[model samples]
Target: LHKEPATLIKAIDGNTVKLMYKGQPMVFRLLLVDIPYGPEAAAFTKKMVENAKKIEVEFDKGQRTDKYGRGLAYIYADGKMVGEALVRQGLAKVAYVYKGNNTHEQHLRKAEAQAKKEKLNIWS
Candidate 1:
């Protein structure tokens, strides 16, 4: 989502990914913030990618900047809140929250519920 060019360093597990930028290993938390994951997640991720194409992101605070020696920040694309976009679209859920007010928590919950109700990946 950030304009950072990244490469897959290693997949720690099905739920975690290790990416490399400039030959440096970077850990990205993919559990909640969705990407084209499974068959269903793919559709949502594709849409999110398209949505991201229209904006930019910035970190408010308590970003996932560590636990992997990498800098992490909540994404803020253009004027839109990109983090919530994933959940709003049912791409991701609130899998893990390191810190913050997380005003989008409710939206995320609703998105999860809707995704389930709509028979998305969660349905599978």
Candidate 2:
């Protein structure tokens, strides 16, 4: 598990964020999940980050960075994975699966399915 400490600086959307990494600004796209693309999703993400006291980023070590040069990671806050939370809350969906990086895929897919079943947010 590749983990890093980061201070969430901005929420670009439900799936993207700007973080303070090692005294520099960095962009991170939440790994293995895709949230709806719009202002509502952005607003949700913004609130989540704004309410968190601390944030930890866990990377998919096997496929750490994306093509856009943004680090792909799972943001954690208060012992919960932010990406997973987004899926569970119906704000995001499990969208990609990469070889050697399927560790969280099952959990994410499960969350998405449950959210879809419950008809929350975008799934509704």
Candidate 3:
């Protein structure tokens, strides 16, 4: 019911997934974040998207895809941005910026800052 909501084909790891986007099995990495929990981030990311009522791929105008043939886009699960959630909870940290494609840089940055200040998980 969201904007061209996608389907979860599979998750390669905590920060990557193969989603059924636009009638194709497209793989995308959760932009601007990396899992610090390693294992928990896997399950946590999985849990956030696995059974969502709706999963959507929100691609940025810049840097459509990566060199590895994977998409560089924001992932929404049941209407929430999963990457932001992970970083906000300290289950992950923001990274891989400076390529001139910072669609949600400041947005995700504020979340990580709060996570660090609160001493959440990895920040603790």
Candidate 4:
């Protein structure tokens, strides 16, 4: 499977899991995008978990989960997107639901551009 950021796996399929980072997962009252299915969701979640490795995540205004019933987090690694890691990797795009709450929009945009230019996994 994939990396486990937190030991809080909701479900277990070998090493991969659906768990929160440390204590509780973040949430967004309003969703930013219509999440994709199959490969898109898998790739997004994978990158998100991968990026979580180098950052300290902070759940400011949200907790539990987003509109899609998935966790919402403002992930920060070296002050980068702990939350937008998926977006940066081109796994997800903005939906404006988390507007004003984002402190890493510029970084995410840059990451997205780079991921696209380099043909990151999200593009695959």
What RMSD, rounded to one decimal, does every model reach?
Answer: 6.0, 1.7, 2.2, 7.2
lDDT of 1 by residue, 11-67 (tens): 343223455545676655442454434555445434443444332223334655656
Order of all candidates by TM-score, from best down to worst?
Answer: 3, 2, 1, 4
| Cα lDDT tens digits for candidate 2, 4-107 | 78898888888899999878898988888876446776777788887888888887746777788888788887557878888898887797675456678998
Model 4: per-residue lDDT, tens digit, 74-117? 53434454335555555555555453445444655677677678
> Sorted by lDDT, highest first, which candidate order results?
3, 2, 1, 4
Better of 2 and 3 by TM-score: 3
Off by over 4 Å in 2: none
Clash pairs detected, candidate 4: 26-72, 27-63, 32-95, 55-77, 75-82, 75-83, 76-82
Give Cα-based local distance difference scores for all models. 0.48, 0.81, 0.85, 0.45
> Best candidate per TM-score, number?
3
Clashing residue pairs, backbone N/CA/C < 3 A, model 3: none
Tell me the spans in candidate 3 whose CA falls farther than 4 Å from its real position.
1-3
Task: Tell me, by lDDT, which candidate is best.
Answer: 3
lDDT of model 4 at position 41? 49
Q: What would the TM-scores of all predictions be?
A: 0.49, 0.89, 0.91, 0.46
lDDT of 3 by residue, 1-124 (tens): 1246789999777889899888999888988887757888888888888879889888775777889999888899988999999999999999878366677889999999999999998999
Global fold similarity of model 2 (TM-score): 0.89
